[PDB]
Amino acid sequence: SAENPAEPVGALLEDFSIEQLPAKTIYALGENIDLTGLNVTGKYDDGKQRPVKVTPEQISGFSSSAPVDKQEVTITIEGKQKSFSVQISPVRVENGVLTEVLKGHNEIILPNSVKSIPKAAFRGSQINKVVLNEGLQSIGDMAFFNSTVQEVVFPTTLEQLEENIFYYCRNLKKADLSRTKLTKLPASTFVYAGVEEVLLPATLKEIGAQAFLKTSQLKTIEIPENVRTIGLEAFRESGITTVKLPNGVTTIAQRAFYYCPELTEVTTYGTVINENPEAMIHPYCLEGCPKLTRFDISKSIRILGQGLLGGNRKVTQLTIPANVTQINFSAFNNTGIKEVMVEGITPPQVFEKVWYGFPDDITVIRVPAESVEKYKNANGWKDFTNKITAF
Ligand SMILES: [Cl-]
Numbered sequence: 001s002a003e004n005p006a007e008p009v010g011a012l013l014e015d016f017s018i019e020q021l022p023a024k025t026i027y028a029l030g031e032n033i034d035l036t037g038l039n040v041t042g043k044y045d046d047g048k049q050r051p052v053k054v055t056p057e058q059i060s061g062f063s064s065s066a067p068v069d070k071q072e073v074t075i076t077i078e079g080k081q082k083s084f085s086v087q088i089s090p091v092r093v094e095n096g097v098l099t100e101v102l103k104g105h106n107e108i109i110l111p112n113s114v115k116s117i118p119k120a121a122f123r124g125s126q127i128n129k130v131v132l133n134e135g136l137q138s139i140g141d142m143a144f145f146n147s148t149v150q151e152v153v154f155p156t157t158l159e160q161l162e163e164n165i166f167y168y169c170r171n172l173k174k175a176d177l178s179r180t181k182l183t184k185l186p187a188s189t190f191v192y193a194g195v196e197e198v199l200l201p202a203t204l205k206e207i208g209a210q211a212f213l214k215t216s217q218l219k220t221i222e223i224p225e226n227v228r229t230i231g232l233e234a235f236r237e238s239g240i241t242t243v244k245l246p247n248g249v250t251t252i253a254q255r256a257f258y259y260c261p262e263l264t265e266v267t268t269y270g271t272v273i274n275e276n277p278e279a280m281i282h283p284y285c286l287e288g289c290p291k292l293t294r295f296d297i298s299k300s301i302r303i304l305g306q307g308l309l310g311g312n313r314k315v316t317q318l319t320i321p322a323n324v325t326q327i328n329f330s331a332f333n334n335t336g337i338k339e340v341m342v343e344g345i346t347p348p349q350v351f352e353k354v355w356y357g358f359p360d361d362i363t364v365i366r367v368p369a370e371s372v373e374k375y376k377n378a379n380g381w382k383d384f385t386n387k388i389t390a391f
């Protein structure tokens with residue numbers, strides 16, 4: 001009850017109209033109506049129009065006992081009635097936690113009261129579509145594990161993810177996370193998922209281990225601008241034909257693109273450079289990629305590991321950028337590379353007694369004209385003296 005009189009002295013409402021609906025039009029089972037945001041204009045018998053605050057006993061037809069897709073809620077004042085629609089979703093929310101999802105509903109629209117989705121909340125769900133609500137902050141482990149879900153709409157408030165959420169989501173065609181606040185895409189997020197397209201947010205800094213493992217339908221991937229790290233086997237056995245990644249990438253873990261049978265290009269973009277002496281493309285990163293013809297190295301990488309393109313024969317030209325300071329044993333060995341351009345005025349260092357950094361049948365190594373002798377006298381590089389020339 002309001003402390004002060006609300007109605008005008010001497011004037012009675014004759015009619016009213018809903019000018020703005022309540023902000024909450026989606027409810028969970030057992031939730032109470034929330035009229036916040038409702039704007040009513042009353043026509044009074046003194047000719048003056050006035051805002052009307054609806055008192056609780058004036059509502060009828062609202063009931064959150066059972067799922068209802070469209071429920072008519074009526075406002076009754078001065079024998080006059082106006083109605084609006086609400087949806088009672090087949091879900092239970094207790095202290096902001098999605099505690100229950102009811103079966104037999106192919107489209108789930110979550111209420112705004114959902115703050116977190118717990119572990120396995122939609123696991124094995126035989127549903128088609130989920131609209132995640134604004135206000136959702138986190139999603140728990142295996143939340144959609146082996147769901148038949150075809151579409152998931154993500155909210156701008158989504159901040160935190162646990163692991164294996166879309167593992168075995170064979171029908172999830174697209175995951176548009178581009179408008180979320182995610183800084184990390186966790187390990188095994190899309191293993192065996194049918195994702196054809198995954199749009200990542202500008203806030204993303206890390207891609208977890210096996211995040212896109214066995215994504216056979218993923219056509220391409222654009223790694224967003226602020227990503228620093230690509231985890232162990234992040235794209236192992238993915239169907240990706242091309243990868244775009246920023247020049248700020250400092251870690252590409254082992255076998256990150258292992259056995260991608262349709263991968264043809266790895267290209268870089270951006271002018272942001274992150275300094276870190278540990279920045280490395282880890283061993284056998286693109287082993288088992290027989291269709292790869294182009295491999296751009298992130299301009300923030302310092303170290304090139306063993307067998308980066310192991311067994312490949314279609315990359316015939318390679319550019320090593322000026323930021324590379326170290327090349328390990330057999331880095332580009334077991335390849336079909338014929339032409340390498342090493343851009344560093346200062347040669348990358350080689351510490352092994354037996355290097356095999358490039359194949360025996362390499363044709364030429366092009367280095368800056370002012371550095372030809374620095375390369376020819378250097379450990380490792382001296383093994384290819386008769387193939388070194390200027391650019
Ligand atoms: Cl409530």
